[PDB]
Scaffold this active site. Structure first.
Site, PDB file in Angstrom:
ATOM      1  N   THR A  36       1.071  -0.907  -0.501  1.00 54.14           N
ATOM      2  CA  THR A  36      -0.130   0.164   0.473  1.00 54.14           C
ATOM      3  C   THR A  36       0.589   1.403  -0.211  1.00 54.14           C
ATOM      4  O   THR A  36       1.900   1.444   0.431  1.00 54.14           O
ATOM      5  CB  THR A  36      -0.905  -0.071   1.258  1.00 54.14           C
ATOM      6  N   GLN A  37       0.584   2.141  -0.671  1.00 55.81           N
ATOM      7  CA  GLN A  37       1.155   3.268  -0.923  1.00 55.81           C
ATOM      8  C   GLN A  37       0.115   4.373  -1.285  1.00 55.81           C
ATOM      9  O   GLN A  37      -0.796   4.791  -0.603  1.00 55.81           O
ATOM     10  CB  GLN A  37       2.451   3.306  -1.804  1.00 55.81           C
TER      11      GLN A  37
END
Ligand SMILES: [Mg+2]
Ligand SMILES: [Mg+2]
Ligand SMILES: [Mg+2]
Lengths: 195, 204, 233, 244, 222, 231, 240, 235, 211
Positions: free
Chosen positions: C1-2
């Site tokens: 996740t970014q």
């Protein structure tokens, strides 16, 4: 589960354990035996999270029975209690710890002495004349601190235990459906069928 | 919730003239509930004494661990471990669990068998050594013990005087702590004799 | 996740009678800052495919390299690399679509919305969409981000269904695309005036137009607007 | 490949013997003789150091007798380096048992564990076995005083009196002749030294060529004491028994 | 935070006849309040006279269908080109779905075809693999709008025979393929009116012993 | 001799005997023929039985709708290699929506067989394969040897007595290549080719195995009464 | 890890390592098993080459796997401990999961399976041990007696012997054991077991071990004097 | 020494060829497939009269519709049976159906060549796998340690195999009944067996569509043996 | 709502048929009884998939047991395979409430309650699910050991009906099973929409409702 009591008298250890098994808003069973015989002269009662209690008890039972066969010899209560403590002390830092509290009542045939060990799920062991887990001790320890004497007879131990159960039945909110009582002495383990 | 104050308890150590003293209460509880009044917190491996406060399962576990390690040390080295060396062993052992520590407050006390020099040391739960000349405190009533020790203590006390000082330091500190008391033990240690005294105190 | 950092806005596209058109502005935004003004977001693959990418630019550059590597790999031990066994739009899309869905399934997505526009071996128009979730769909008109909300409505007036495609010429289609790009410049706060446009025709091949600008803008009427209600001066 | 150079240490002969075990036993038969004698009131361990020198520092030296814990000790016969590997393992096992059960390890359980390790090297792994034979002298509250021996095969047996290393055939005959069940430690000490004195390949048995130990309940009241004899103490017991 | 799931809308419907089966679904694909495609096929022919649709999150739906089609291919390879029965396909899909029990295919799956006695069959799945053979099943966005209608018009629920007043039920007479297709079309027309994610087009796949046939119908595009 | 104990050992003349012995297993295997035109590719295989009570060992395996092979030698090794091809054909479809090229299929088989010839512990594959397929560049026929060598051919044959069929195809080269849009005549040429490798025994209904793939023809295998037409 | 194939086929279709493991069993001390009508008796030879032994602590030849099953063996002593340990662990594991003790057949099948696994696993040699496994199934009064061997094959026996000179004692049992009427009592069964060992043993002193297993976990090992009485009675009848 | 997976100059795997020699030393097993069922029969061959012959388990159930007989190093068969049973049950779990006899046999044969330097050597046992499915009907397969399996109308494996196979060559026809097959297995077993055939040293079994796989009682086989003796004395 | 109780004539198993997703009635025709073999039954409550998947899996394990051991699996052993399995997944979020019911020679009629929390309980009577309390009321006041197969079947049917009425997440229809020494016996699907009015009229109960 709920209430488990232990008392060590002159020549025996007496364990009392509730019969109720409540799963939510319903009392599913009223005759549940919350104990396992680890060896002929060693009994362990247990209480904690559902599933974990029995899984742990039977795991310990199997290990001690394996030891008995391998050495053709019964481990002392002290030795069994230390083994159990280490398993719980190992367990508390696991991915998913055993959420189980136990009492170990045994008669040491070598020393000719009854022995009661109280161990919680963290692996906190203490040898006691009388013990309890959960909210049981809050009601019962005052009575025991009062009426218990170390030279008591098994019958006197049972009478003092009745006094404890009566107080619990009076003041505890939960209906634990009475207790199954078991005596551990030189002759082994037996159940008091009328209590 | 706070692991260091579930079971409760205290330990204090002091140096005297050619002697050391280490003491502890006997209480073990489950928060408000008193469970045992015979849970000793001082152990010894040869002539080196170790007191441990904090979470009781870890107190028991570490004792078993240092018994294990000091027994092997002795077999290989062919001599008993000394206080200075044991102190380093305790530090090493604790720091190896840096990010999953034992919730304890150890206290080492003893006399070097070769030099005769009295030695005490304290640690945090992760190994930092506090090597004090005067005294070391540990437990739920450490603040109280600091105040008692800092005012009562004076250097170069004789064994029988040191006993009175450490006993009064422990007793009055425990009486201001809800999770300490229920009995007490005091070890008076000299180069080749050790006396153990159980103290009479209020049982509330 | 970014979280996406340097981003590209709308990519718009549509089918016409002999091929497909795709377009995307040359901006790389850094939040509200219009930081990079020379970013090419249309990346051709061979002479029959153009991949238009919006969203995170670092992930776009990664995808750009995967495609470059794909061409290299396809040429290996392939005597027909520039003929029968050349990369098709459908091959390139399915590859990306596989990667996108794999990455979302590892909870580490490529933060993009991609449109693969091209013409197949048999002359069929190819136009399909894929995004960070691995979601895919095809339509006569496809657009990402703001283009979905503003461009599609305009482009769907030209090609409302499949039967309108043979009736639509390249001049009419390009006109619609260029108009849509102007509208997005009026109304998207993360658009630039400068953009690139690509046509993939089954007859004339790949025509790649750079350094295009939005022109014929209406602003004069702004002079007559005064205050926010009651003000006259 | 590598197969070409593999000795195959863990295989049977056509006769059903383990080559490497048999050859390891041959190695051990050249090692200094070690004797164990069990009495009603204690156990004796006696062992001969191999052709020593005058420049060897004897008082700090240890090649035969080792301490496993406060209750159990071993006499070594074979490769000393191999023995120390196993000894450190045994020491750890005893400590593990003590930590788990809070009781000192029963002698047989320790002996079985080491013997199982030796066994493993004869069945799997492709490694050479440990060229070591032990005499275990120990005490616990179940069986009291116990003597065991283990060898490279991993087989162990209990004994009243036993020898390992060189000249065991001659030594075992001499022990079998003079041993009696009602024997005491002081008598067993004498028997052990007399046996070594007759079976030794050396010209004479002296203090500098011996290691000696006793496990006695001759400790103040119900408890057990291990005594690893010092060079001067071995010299005194040699004079007492009338060998020098 | 990254949300690995999405909702592509749509609605599907399976009805099992006496010797046929239908699996219908609208062709609209959406996110939030936008239309992605007015024609994005959702119901697929998977071979062996089986039709399938995985409605919900299209990425998981396309992945599942793709993996099942693959399973059919390997079933032929591994078991001497044996035909995969609808009951066997259903069980296989349970294992595909439950294989991702702790990171589910966010889809409502339905398959349709014929059982080994030649009768019409429809199987319905939840996202984590629980399945059940049914005579009738709608899935997806407007399933709540359609199923009650099907309980009433296919199984004749709450319907009784005039004159008896609640004593005698309406008999469960079998429906023809032409009758089922009418109910399917009316179901989707009604769903389109009251559900914003339903519209554009209706594609129906009909399965008989002769094979798989397709029918397409326009729906409102608003 | 001294250099045939394992696959990791060259002989003094630069030969790999274990590979050559694996090659020998193919020569012991039953004959199979491959040939193609511009539109279709055909496999013909003589199946072998253990005795009269036994079935005839299957020789042809399908890899995809557009590709498959026939085997000669160790059948389990052909199962391993055909399984690998099935996976590679399948990977190409699922990932790239692309039917695997027959030439690229040969390259993958070559590389898989090669690893077994250079490493210690393993062994070469003990089977030869004839791969036919129809891809974007038309009909193809490959010959796989477990040495790793893969060769694209108009026609060929492997197995026992395969030299007879191979010579026939070498004569008929100009004829059968021109058989376009006529599957039955291309099979006839293949059945006539494999007949040049027969001795004592002849082609019966449960003896003969034929496969075909082409322009509008999925890879299909014909056995039993389906090949009686060609006997 | 060490992966070398030690147990492999030879040109004549023999696995020599497995066959050489049987030669180790042939060398081992004799063990015999005889089942009566309501009991099983396990007899074991103790070679008298080893005196000055401590018989209290020396590993006994018959081992309890559970309270109702016993295991004796012939062959390598060290190898037998590994099988016994595994068997004991499996016995407790079976009780834990099935909530019922192992059948004698099941326990045998497990031990035999372990022995087989060591004949086609890399880097390991076969067990040089054959076992006799005896006991009574839970809530069953039918006697059970099984044999295993290094190859991993196992089977049930009315009576059987293994180890050195087992050929001789098997000869004795084959003529003396009647299937239609097995040893009706414990006495008759023990007597026949001692008689069979006396064909091979040498002296009937401390060279014979006897263990009687009866139904419902009733297992007892006979002492020297009890066995010596059988030895005395047998030879006094023989003097005629 | 030499590799376990080594090829001989003739192009055969040494170890596979040597395992075939071990199978020739094994006890005889015969299988006969008919349109009414498949019959499986084995020679028990007890090494001593004190060995309880009913404990000799050389015929084994894999599933309700698949049985199996063995010959050679029978201890090696146990893991093959365990795999077969697991494969059969697992397929039913995945596909809600019985598994095809051929597919079951193929799954077993996949284990065969998984040996090297995986297990250390090939299996030293051959299997006769007999069963029924809806697609191909009653089937009999011969699974070898080479990984090869042939389907058979009738097959004999073990020490008396080539003599028995020659006998099966003459006797088998496509219209055999189940009763005729039973007697035929008994007849050929009696021919090749060293000891005299009876219900205690020989075992019969069959697989039918209705009743599934059944091992025959010693009382049931004894009657078939008596029926055989009389019909041979009849001419 | 699902129940199971021991009595003179073996075991009675009764379950409802409803499946919900929130307030939405997903199905009224669910099979909450699992026929593991001719002698074992499994009841399903909680997560539909979890129960279905792992109980059909249980049947594969029970089949493998009797293939290996040539003997029918005990109810104790069968139940413990399932409980030991779900215990491995403890914490992961499985949701199961199950009764494993069967008959063997050594045990007689036996019922085990198995739970996704790891709980395994033997007992004579069990009621599980959202409507368990409603079923318990009827059962406890009418249960006896000396019940006829006919009367026991009705009590189980009636106890589900009671819960189907009051519990919103229970209903649809009633499936009855009767487990004896010779195996289980299905006793039909009973629609609540018809059963309610039938019972009300014949029994004289449900006087609060109007009909
Ligand atoms: Mg207080
Ligand atoms: Mg709408
Ligand atoms: Mg309701």
């Amino acid at each position: 589960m709920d209430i488990i009591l232990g008392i060590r008298v002159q020549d025996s250890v007496i364990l009392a354990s509730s019969k109720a098994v409540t799963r939510g808003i319903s009392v599913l069973k009223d005759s549940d035996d919350k104990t396992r015989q680890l060896s002929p002269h060693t009994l362990m009662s247990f209480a904690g999270e559902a599933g974990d209690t029995v899984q742990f008890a039977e795991y310990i039972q199997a290990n001690i029975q394996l030891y008995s066969i391998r050495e053709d010899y019964e481990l002392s209560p002290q030795a069994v209690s230390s083994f159990v403590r280490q398993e719980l002390a190992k367990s508390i830092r696991s991915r998913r710890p055993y959420q189980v509290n136990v009492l170990i009542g045994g008669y040491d045939k070598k020393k000719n002495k009854p022995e009661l060990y109280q161990i919680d799920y963290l692996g906190t062991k203490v040898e006691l004349p009388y013990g309890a887990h959960g909210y049981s001790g809050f009601y019962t320890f005052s009575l025991l601190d009062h009426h218990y004497r170390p030279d008591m007879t098994t019958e006197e131990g049972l009478d003092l235990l009745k006094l404890c159960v009566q107080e619990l039945e009076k003041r505890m909110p939960m209906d634990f459906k009475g207790v199954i009582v078991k005596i551990v002495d030189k002759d082994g383990i037996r159940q008091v069928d009328d209590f | 919730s706070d692991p260091s104050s579930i079971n409760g308890g205290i330990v204090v150590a002091m140096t005297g003239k050619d002697c050391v003293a280490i003491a502890c209460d006997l209480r073990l509880g489950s928060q408000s509930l008193g469970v045992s009044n015979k849970f000793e917190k001082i152990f010894h491996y040869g002539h080196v004494f170790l007191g441990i406060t904090g979470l009781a399962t870890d107190v028991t576990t570490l004792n078993e661990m240092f018994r294990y390690k000091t027994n092997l040390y002795k077999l290989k080295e062919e001599r008993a471990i000394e206080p200075e060396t044991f102190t380093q062993l305790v530090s090493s052992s604790l720091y190896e669990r840096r990010f999953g520590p034992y919730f304890v407050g150890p206290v080492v006390a003893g006399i070097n068998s070769k030099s005769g020099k009295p030695f005490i040391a304290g640690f945090d739960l992760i190994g930092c050594i506090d090597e004090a000349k005067d005294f070391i405190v540990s437990g739920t009533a450490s603040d109280q013990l600091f105040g008692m020790c800092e005012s009562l203590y004076e250097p170069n006390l004789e064994p029988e005087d040191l006993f009175e000082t450490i006993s009064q330091a422990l007793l009055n500190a425990a009486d201001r702590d809800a999770l300490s008391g229920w009995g007490a033990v005091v070890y008076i240690i000299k180069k080749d004799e050790v006396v153990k005294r159980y103290l009479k105190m209020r049982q509330d | 996740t970014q979280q996406p950092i340097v981003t590209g806005t709308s990519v718009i596209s549509m089918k016409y009678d002999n091929g497909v058109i795709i377009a995307a502005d040359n901006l790389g935004s850094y939040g509200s800052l219009l930081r990079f003004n020379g970013v090419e977001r249309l990346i051709p693959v061979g002479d029959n495919t153009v991949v238009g990418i919006s969203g995170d630019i670092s992930d776009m550059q990664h995808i750009e390299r995967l495609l470059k590597d794909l061409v290299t790999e396809n040429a290996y031990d392939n005597p027909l690399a520039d003929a029968e066994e050349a990369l098709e739009p459908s091959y390139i899309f399915e590859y990306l679509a596989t990667v996108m869905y794999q990455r979302r399934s590892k909870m580490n997505p490529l933060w993009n919305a991609i449109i693969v526009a091209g013409v197949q071996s048999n002359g069929d128009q190819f136009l399909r969409y894929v995004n960070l979730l691995g979601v895919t769909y095809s339509s006569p008109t496809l657009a990402t981000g703001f283009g979905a909300h503003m461009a599609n409505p305009l482009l769907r007036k030209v090609v409302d269904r499949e039967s309108d495609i043979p009736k639509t010429t390249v001049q009419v289609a390009e006109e619609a695309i260029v108009n849509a790009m102007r509208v997005l410049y009026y109304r998207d706060a993360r658009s630039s005036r400068n953009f690139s446009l690509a046509i993939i025709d089954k007859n004339t091949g790949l025509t790649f137009k750079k350094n295009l600008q939005v022109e014929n803008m209406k602003w004069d009427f702004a002079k007559d607007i005064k205050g926010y209600g009651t003000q006259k001066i | 490949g590598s197969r070409r150079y593999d000795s195959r240490t863990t295989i049977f002969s056509p006769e059903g013997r383990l080559y490497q075990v048999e050859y390891a036993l041959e190695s051990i038969s050249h090692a200094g003789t070690a004797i164990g004698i069990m009495a009603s009131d204690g156990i004796v361990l006696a062992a001969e150091r191999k052709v020593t020198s005058t420049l060897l520092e004897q008082d700090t030296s240890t090649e035969k007798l080792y301490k496993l814990n406060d209750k159990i000790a071993v006499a070594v016969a074979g490769l000393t380096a191999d023995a120390e590997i196993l000894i450190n393992t045994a020491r750890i096992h005893a400590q593990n048992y003590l930590k788990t059960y809070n009781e000192d390890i029963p002698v047989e359980i320790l002996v079985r564990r080491l013997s199982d390790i030796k066994q493993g090297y004869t069945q799997h792994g492709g490694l050479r076995p440990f060229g070591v034979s032990f005499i275990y002298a120990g005490y616990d509250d179940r069986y009291g005083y116990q003597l065991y021996t283990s060898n490279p095969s991993g087989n162990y047996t209990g004994w009243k009196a036993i020898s390992v290393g060189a000249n065991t055939s001659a030594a075992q005959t001499l022990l079998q002749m003079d041993y009696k069940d009602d024997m005491k430690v002081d008598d067993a000490i004498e028997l052990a030294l007399k046996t070594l004195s007759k079976t030794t390949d050396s010209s004479a048995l002296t203090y500098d060529r011996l290691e000696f130990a006793t496990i006695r309940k001759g400790a103040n009241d119900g408890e057990v004491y291990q005594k690893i004899f010092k060079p001067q103490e071995i010299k005194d017991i040699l004079v007492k028994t009338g060998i020098t | 935070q990254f949300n690995p799931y999405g909702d592509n809308g749509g609605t599907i419907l399976g009805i099992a006849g006496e010797d046929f089966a239908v699996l219908a679904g609208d062709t609209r694909n959406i996110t939030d309040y936008s239309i992605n495609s007015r024609y994005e096929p959702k119901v697929f022919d998977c071979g062996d006279n089986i039709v399938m649709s995985a409605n919900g999150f299209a990425a998981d739906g396309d992945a599942l269908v793709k993996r099942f089609k693959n399973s059919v291919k390997w079933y032929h390879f591994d078991h001497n080109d044996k035909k995969l029965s609808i009951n066997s396909a259903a069980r296989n899909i349970q294992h595909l779905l439950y294989g991702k029990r702790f990171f589910p295919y966010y889809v409502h799956t339905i398959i349709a075809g014929l059982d080994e006695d030649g009768k019409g069959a429809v199987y319905s799945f939840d996202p984590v693999g629980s399945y059940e053979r049914e005579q009738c099943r709608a899935g997806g966005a407007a399933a709540s709008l359609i199923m009650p209608f099907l309980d009433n018009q296919v199984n004749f629920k709450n319907q009784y025979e005039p004159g008896t007043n609640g004593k005698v039920k309406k008999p469960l007479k079998y429906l023809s393929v032409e009758e089922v297709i009418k109910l399917v079309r009316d179901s989707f027309t009604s769903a389109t009116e009251r559900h914003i994610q339903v519209g554009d087009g209706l594609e129906i796949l009909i399965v008989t012993k002769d094979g798989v046939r397709k029918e397409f119908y326009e729906l409102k595009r608003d | 001799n001294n250099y045939d104990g394992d696959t990791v050992t060259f002989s003094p003349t630069g030969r790999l005997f274990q590979v050559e012995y694996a090659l020998e297993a193919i020569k012991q295997g039953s004959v199979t023929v491959g040939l193609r035109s511009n539109t279709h590719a055909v496999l013909v295989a003589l199946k072998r039985n253990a005795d009269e009570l036994s079935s005839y060992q299957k020789k042809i395996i399908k890899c995809d709708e557009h590709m498959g092979l026939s085997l000669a030698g160790l059948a389990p090794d052909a199962r391993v290699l055909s399984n690998y091809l099935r996976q590679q054909c399948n990977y190409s479809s699922l990932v790239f929506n692309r039917k695997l090229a027959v030439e690229r299929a040969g390259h993958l088989l070559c590389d898989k067989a090669q690893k077994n010839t250079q490493s210690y512990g393993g062994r070469p594959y003990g089977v030869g394969l004839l791969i036919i397929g129809y891809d974007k560049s038309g009909a193809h026929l490959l010959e796989f040897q477990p040495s790793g060598n893969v060769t694209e051919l108009y026609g060929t044959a492997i197995g026992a007595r395969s030299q007879g069929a191979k010579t026939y195809l070498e004569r008929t080269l100009d004829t059968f290549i021109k058989i376009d849009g006529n599957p039955d005549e291309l099979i006839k040429a293949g059945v006539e080719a494999i007949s040049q490798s027969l001795r004592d025994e002849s082609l019966t209904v449960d003896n003969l195995s034929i496969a075909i793939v082409g322009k509008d023809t999925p890879f299909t295998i014909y056995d039993g009464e389906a090949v009686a037409k060609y006997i | 890890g060490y992966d070398r194939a030690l147990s492999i086929f030879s040109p004549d279709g023999h696995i020599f390592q497995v066959e050489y493991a049987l030669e180790a069993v042939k060398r081992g001390t004799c063990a015999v098993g005889v089942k009566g009508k309501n009991c099983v008796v396990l007899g074991c030879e103790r070679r008298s080459t080893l005196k000055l032994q401590d018989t209290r602590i020396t590993p006994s030849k018959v081992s309890k796997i559970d309270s109702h099953v016993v295991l004796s063996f012939s062959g390598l002593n060290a190898d037998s401990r590994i099988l016994i340990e595994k068997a004991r662990v499996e016995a407790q594991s079976h009780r834990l999961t099935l909530e019922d003790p192992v059948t004698v057949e099941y326990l045998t099948r497990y031990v035999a399976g372990v022995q087989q696994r060591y004949t086609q696993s890399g880097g390991v040699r076969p067990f040089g041990v054959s076992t006799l496994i005896a006991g009574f199934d839970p809530r069953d009064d039918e006697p059970k007696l099984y044999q295993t061997e290094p190859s991993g094959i196992y089977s049930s026996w009315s009576a059987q012997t293994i180890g050195r000179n087992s050929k001789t004692v098997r000869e004795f049992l084959e003529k003396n054991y009647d299937r239609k009427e097995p040893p009706a009592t414990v006495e008759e069964c023990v007597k026949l077991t001692v008689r069979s060992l006396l064909e091979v043993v040498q002296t009937g002193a401390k060279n014979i071990e006897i263990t009687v297993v009866k139904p419902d976990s009733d297992i007892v090992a006979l002492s020297s004097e009890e066995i010596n009485q059988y030895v005395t009675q047998i030879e006094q009848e023989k003097q005629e | 020494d030499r590799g376990v997976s080594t090829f001989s100059p003739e192009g055969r795997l040494f170890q596979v060829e040597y395992s075939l020699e071990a199978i020739k030393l094994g006890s005889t097993a015969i299988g006969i497939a008919t349109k009414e069922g498949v019959v499986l029969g084995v020679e028990k061959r007890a090494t001593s009269p004190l060995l309880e012959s009913d404990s000799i388990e050389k015929i084994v159930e894999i599933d309700r519709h698949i049985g199996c007989a063995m010959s050679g190093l029978t201890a090696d068969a146990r893991s093959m049976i365990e795999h077969a049973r697991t494969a059969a049950v697992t397929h039913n779990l995945y596909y809600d159906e019985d598994i095809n006899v051929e597919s079951l046999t193929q799954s077993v044969c996949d284990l065969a060549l998984r040996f090297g330097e995986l297990m250390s050597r090939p299996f030293g046992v051959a299997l006769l796998i007999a069963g029924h499915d809806a697609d191909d009907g009653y089937q009999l397969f011969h699974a070898e340690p080479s990984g090869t399996f042939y389907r058979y109308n009738a097959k004999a494996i073990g020490s008396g195999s080539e003599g028995a196979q020659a006998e099966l060559l003459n006797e088998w026809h496509s219209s055999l009944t189940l009763k005729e097959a039973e007697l035929l297995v008994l007849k050929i077993l009696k021919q090749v067996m060293e000891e005299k055939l009876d219900e205690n040293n020989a075992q019969l079994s069959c697989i039918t569509k209705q009743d599934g796989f059944k091992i025959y009682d010693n009382e049931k086989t004894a009657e078939l043996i008596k029926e055989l003796k009389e019909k041979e004395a009849a001419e | 709502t699902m129940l199971a109780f021991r009595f003179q004539g073996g075991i009675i198993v009764a379950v409802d048929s409803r499946a919900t997703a929130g307030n939405w009635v997903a199905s009224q025709t669910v099979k909450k009884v699992i026929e593991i073999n001719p002698f074992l039954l499994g009841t399903m409550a909680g997560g539909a998939a979890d129960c279905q998947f792992w109980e059909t899996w249980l049947g594969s394990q029970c089949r493998l047991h009797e293939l290996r051991e040539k003997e029918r699996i005990s109810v104790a052993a069968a139940s413990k395979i399932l409980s030991n399995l779900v215990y491995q997944y403890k914490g992961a979020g499985l949701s199961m409430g199950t009764m494993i019911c069967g008959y063997t020679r050594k045990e007689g009629p036996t019922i085990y309650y198995v739970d996704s929390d790891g709980t395994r309980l033997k007992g004579d009577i069990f009621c599980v699910g959202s409507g368990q309390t409603f079923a318990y009321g009827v059962l406890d006041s009418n249960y006896k050991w000396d019940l006829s197969v006919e009367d026991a079947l009705y009590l189980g049917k009636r106890s589900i009906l009671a819960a189907a009425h009051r519990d919103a997440y229970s209903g649809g229809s009633v499936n009855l099973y009767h487990v004896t020494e010779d195996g289980w016996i299905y006793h039909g699907n009973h629609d609540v929409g018809e059963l309610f009015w039938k019972v009300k009229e014949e029994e004289g109960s449900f006087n609060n409702v109007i009909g």
